[PDB]
Design an enzyme around this catalytic site. Structure first.
Site, PDB file in Angstrom:
ATOM      1  N   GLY A  17       0.778  -1.221   0.000  1.00  0.00           N
ATOM      2  CA  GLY A  17       0.000   0.000   0.000  1.00  0.00           C
ATOM      3  C   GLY A  17       0.813   1.277   0.000  1.00  0.00           C
ATOM      4  O   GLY A  17       2.010   1.259   0.261  1.00  0.00           O
ATOM      5  N   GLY A  19       0.415   5.472   1.300  1.00  0.00           N
ATOM      6  CA  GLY A  19      -0.346   6.533   1.927  1.00  0.00           C
ATOM      7  C   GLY A  19       0.494   7.786   2.048  1.00  0.00           C
ATOM      8  O   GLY A  19       1.539   7.761   2.694  1.00  0.00           O
ATOM      9  N   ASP A 132      -9.714   7.207  15.279  1.00  0.00           N
ATOM     10  CA  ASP A 132      -9.932   7.064  13.841  1.00  0.00           C
ATOM     11  C   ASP A 132     -10.056   5.582  13.474  1.00  0.00           C
ATOM     12  O   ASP A 132      -9.604   5.176  12.412  1.00  0.00           O
ATOM     13  CB  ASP A 132      -8.813   7.784  13.037  1.00  0.00           C
ATOM     14  CG  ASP A 132      -9.117   7.983  11.552  1.00  0.00           C
ATOM     15  OD1 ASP A 132     -10.218   8.483  11.229  1.00  0.00           O
ATOM     16  OD2 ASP A 132      -8.251   7.628  10.712  1.00  0.00           O
TER      17      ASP A 132
HETATM   18  C1  5O1 Z   1      -0.249  -9.665   2.170  1.00  0.00           C
HETATM   19  O1  5O1 Z   1       0.058  -8.349   2.550  1.00  0.00           O
HETATM   20  C2  5O1 Z   1      -1.041  -7.553   2.738  1.00  0.00           C
HETATM   21  C3  5O1 Z   1      -1.985  -7.444   1.728  1.00  0.00           C
HETATM   22  C4  5O1 Z   1      -3.081  -6.608   1.902  1.00  0.00           C
HETATM   23  C5  5O1 Z   1      -4.103  -6.509   0.901  1.00  0.00           C
HETATM   24  C6  5O1 Z   1      -4.637  -7.575   0.120  1.00  0.00           C
HETATM   25  N1  5O1 Z   1      -5.607  -7.128  -0.705  1.00  0.00           N
HETATM   26  N2  5O1 Z   1      -5.698  -5.796  -0.461  1.00  0.00           N
HETATM   27  C7  5O1 Z   1      -6.658  -4.944  -1.169  1.00  0.00           C
HETATM   28  C8  5O1 Z   1      -4.800  -5.375   0.505  1.00  0.00           C
HETATM   29  C9  5O1 Z   1      -3.196  -5.891   3.084  1.00  0.00           C
HETATM   30  C10 5O1 Z   1      -2.259  -6.006   4.092  1.00  0.00           C
HETATM   31  C11 5O1 Z   1      -1.163  -6.846   3.946  1.00  0.00           C
HETATM   32  N3  5O1 Z   1      -0.187  -7.033   4.929  1.00  0.00           N
HETATM   33  C12 5O1 Z   1       0.316  -6.045   5.750  1.00  0.00           C
HETATM   34  N4  5O1 Z   1       1.229  -6.537   6.716  1.00  0.00           N
HETATM   35  C13 5O1 Z   1       1.740  -5.641   7.525  1.00  0.00           C
HETATM   36  C14 5O1 Z   1       1.412  -4.254   7.455  1.00  0.00           C
HETATM   37  C15 5O1 Z   1       1.949  -3.282   8.312  1.00  0.00           C
HETATM   38  C16 5O1 Z   1       1.543  -1.987   8.129  1.00  0.00           C
HETATM   39  N5  5O1 Z   1       0.659  -1.575   7.178  1.00  0.00           N
HETATM   40  C17 5O1 Z   1       0.146  -2.509   6.356  1.00  0.00           C
HETATM   41  N6  5O1 Z   1      -0.735  -2.154   5.371  1.00  0.00           N
HETATM   42  C18 5O1 Z   1      -1.308  -0.818   5.242  1.00  0.00           C
HETATM   43  C19 5O1 Z   1      -1.660  -0.601   3.763  1.00  0.00           C
HETATM   44  C20 5O1 Z   1      -2.639  -1.684   3.327  1.00  0.00           C
HETATM   45  C21 5O1 Z   1      -3.914  -1.595   4.151  1.00  0.00           C
HETATM   46  C22 5O1 Z   1      -3.587  -1.770   5.629  1.00  0.00           C
HETATM   47  C23 5O1 Z   1      -2.592  -0.709   6.082  1.00  0.00           C
HETATM   48  C24 5O1 Z   1       0.506  -3.895   6.468  1.00  0.00           C
HETATM   49  N7  5O1 Z   1      -0.060  -4.776   5.599  1.00  0.00           N
END
Ligand code: 5O1
Length: 258
Positions: A17, A19, A132
Site C-alpha cells: 500500500g 499513503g 480514527d
Molecule cells: C499480504 O500483505 C497484505 C496485503 C493486503 C491486501 C490484500 N488485498 N488488499 C486490497 C490489501 C493488506 C495487508 C497486507 N499485509 C500487511 N502486513 C503488515 C502491514 C503493516 C503496516 N501496514 C500494512 N498495510 C497498510 C496498507 C494496506 C492496508 C492496511 C494498512 C501492512 N499490511
C-alpha cells in the site's frame, strides 16, 4: 529492488500500500522470512507530522510487550530523510477482507471482536485513544486480528476516507476511550449486518446529522445471537456516558460465553 534497515538487507516482493509520503512493502530477509516494511519519505514533512511519526513509533515499540494483538515492530531506521519500520507481514487488512467476504462465520466474528477489544483496550491503558478506528486499522495475521496503528501517524490504503465510523461526540465538539467503542461497534455492526449503521445515507451532511440525532433510530434487525445484538446496541449509544466501556465489553456474554 532491495532496501537496508539497520544493516539487514530485504528484497522487495511487492508494494502492499501507499499513503501520503508513506509506502508499505512485502519483503524478504536473507533467510527468506516475510516481513512488511513501512517506508516514510520525510523530505516534505512538517515538524507536527514528523513528530506524529516519532510518537507513533515510540508507542508501537512501547506497546510490543503489553499485547500480542498489536502488530510486531521488529526494527526501524530513522533519518532526517526517511523512516523504515520492519514489521510482521499479515495476510490482509480487515477492510479488504470484509469487502471480499460474501458471509462471515459467527465464530470468526466473535474471535475478531475479542482481538479488537484486547488491542484497543491495551492502547487505552497507556492513555491513547485511536479516535480514527476503521477495519483498515486491523491486520489479519495467523487468523488473528492485530491493531496496525494508533491513529497518530497518517493512514494508508492498498494498491479516500470515510465518516461512517465517526462518533457523535466528535461531530458535536464543533473524545475519550468511549469514542473508540463507538467505532469498534460500527465495525462489529458491519461484520454483522454487512453494512455500517449510517452507510445508506449518501448525503454526507445528512449522514453527520443522522449520527448526532437522538431521534434517528439505528436499526438492529433480530439475529440468532441475542448477545451480539445487545453488544451492538450498547456500543452505538449516542451518549458516551451511557455507551458501554471496553472493560464491560470484555465481561459481556458475547465474548465470555460460547
Ligand atoms: C499480504 O500483505 C497484505 C496485503 C493486503 C491486501 C490484500 N488485498 N488488499 C486490497 C490489501 C493488506 C495487508 C497486507 N499485509 C500487511 N502486513 C503488515 C502491514 C503493516 C503496516 N501496514 C500494512 N498495510 C497498510 C496498507 C494496506 C492496508 C492496511 C494498512 C501492512 N499490511
Amino acid at each position: 529492488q532491495s532496501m537496508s534497515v539497520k544493516g539487514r538487507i530485504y528484497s522487495i516482493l511487492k508494494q502492499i500500500g501507499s499513503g501520503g509520503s508513506s509506502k508499505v512493502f512485502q519483503v524478504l530477509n536473507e533467510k527468506k522470512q516475510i516481513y512488511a516494511i513501512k517506508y516514510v519519505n520525510l523530505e516534505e514533512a512538517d515538524n507536527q507530522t514528523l513528530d506524529s511519526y516519532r510518537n507513533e513509533i515510540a508507542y508501537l515499540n512501547k506497546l510490543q510487550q503489553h499485547s500480542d494483538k498489536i502488530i510486531r515492530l521488529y526494527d526501524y531506521e530513522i533519518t532526517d530523510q526517511y523512516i523504515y519500520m520492519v514489521m510482521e507481514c499479515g495476510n490482509i487488512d480487515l477492510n479488504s477482507w470484509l469487502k471480499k467476504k460474501k458471509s462471515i462465520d459467527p465464530w470468526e466474528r466473535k474471535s475478531y471482536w475479542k482481538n479488537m477489544l484486547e488491542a484497543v483496550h491495551t492502547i487505552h491503558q497507556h492513555g491513547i485513544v485511536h479516535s480514527d478506528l476503521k477495519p483498515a486499522n486491523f491486520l489479519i495475521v495467523d487468523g488473528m486480528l492485530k491493531l496496525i496503528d494508533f491513529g497518530i501517524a497518517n493512514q494508508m490504503q492498498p494498491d479516500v476516507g470515510t465518516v461512517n465510523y465517526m462518533p457523535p461526540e466528535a461531530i458535536k465538539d464543533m473524545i475519550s476511550p468511549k469514542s473508540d467503542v463507538w467505532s469498534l461497534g460500527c465495525i462489529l455492526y458491519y461484520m454483522t449486518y454487512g453494512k455500517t449503521p449510517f452507510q445508506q445515507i449518501i448525503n454526507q451532511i445528512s449522514k453527520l446529522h443522522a449520527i448526532i440525532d437522538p431521534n434517528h433510530e439505528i436499526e438492529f434487525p433480530d439475529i440468532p445471537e441475542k448477545d451480539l445484538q445487545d453488544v451492538l446496541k450498547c456500543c452505538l449509544k449516542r451518549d458516551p456516558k451511557q455507551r458501554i466501556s471496553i472493560p464491560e465489553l470484555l465481561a459481556h456474554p458475547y465474548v465470555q460465553i460460547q
